[PDB]
Amino acid sequence: DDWRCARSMHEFSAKDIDGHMVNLDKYRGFVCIVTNVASQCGKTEVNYTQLVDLHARYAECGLRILAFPCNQFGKQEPGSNEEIKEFAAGYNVKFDMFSKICVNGDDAHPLWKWMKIQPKGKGSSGNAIKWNFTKFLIDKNGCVVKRYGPMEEPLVIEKDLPHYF
């Protein structure tokens, strides 16, 4: 498949939560967390609060966050893009919200197919996204430099950011 030959996050596009196509070369020169989100997960509150905390404190350093709603995990993102955006606003989210997608399967977003086979994007037992709130860390070149699991609170990520800024 074509997404398999991609070199960078910056070769992909995705529909934002308003429905506008974003070319992800927009993020060239920025360090990015790309994460799959859900509104009705045991981990929704810590992930959203800690992603907003990291964006507040490192946006000025060049941190950007891309949140992808995904309903594939206990169906914990059943809402519309409208409802999910309002939900996010509730956490004072000022980072980039995207339209709801699949991250696993034939219809997985090609960025999500690509990230999960990156030399530094490999998972622990196969590459499938295992639950809500997986985080990939993307360098200023759009290369995947770390994957953190659903069990790894986003502030876990703070210690590695200075390596990529």
Sequence ranges of the domains in the chain: 2-163
Q: For residue 128, which of 100, 98, 143, 150 has the smallest C-alpha distance? A: 150
Q: What single DSSP character describes residue 43?
A: T
DSSP line for 77-122: --S-HHHHHHHHHTTT--SEEB---BSSSTTB-HHHHHHTTSTTT-
H-only helix segments in 9-101: 44-58, 81-89
Distance CA 151, CA 134 (A): 8
Distance CA 132, CA 51 (A): 14
What CATH topology corresponds to 2-163?
Glutaredoxin (3.40.30)
Q: For residue 144, which of 109, 113, 120 has the smallest C-alpha distance? A: 120
Distance CA 153, CA 126 (A): 21
Q: What single DSSP character describes residue 38?
A: -
Question: Quick check: helix, strand or coil at residue 141?
Answer: coil
Region label for 151, one of left (φ > 0), alpha (ψ between -120 and 50) or beta (otherwise): alpha
Distance CA 41, CA 43 (A): 5
Method: X-ray
Strand pairing class (135-138; 31-37)? antiparallel
User: Which helix (H) or strand (E) is 147 found in, with range?
Assistant: strand 144-148
Amino acid at 126: G
Resolution reading in Å: 1.9
Q: For residue 118, which of 1, 14, 9, 33 has the smallest C-alpha distance? A: 9
Distance CA 103, CA 31 (A): 21
Distance CA 154, CA 134 (A): 9
Distance CA 81, CA 69 (A): 8
Distance CA 140, CA 77 (A): 30
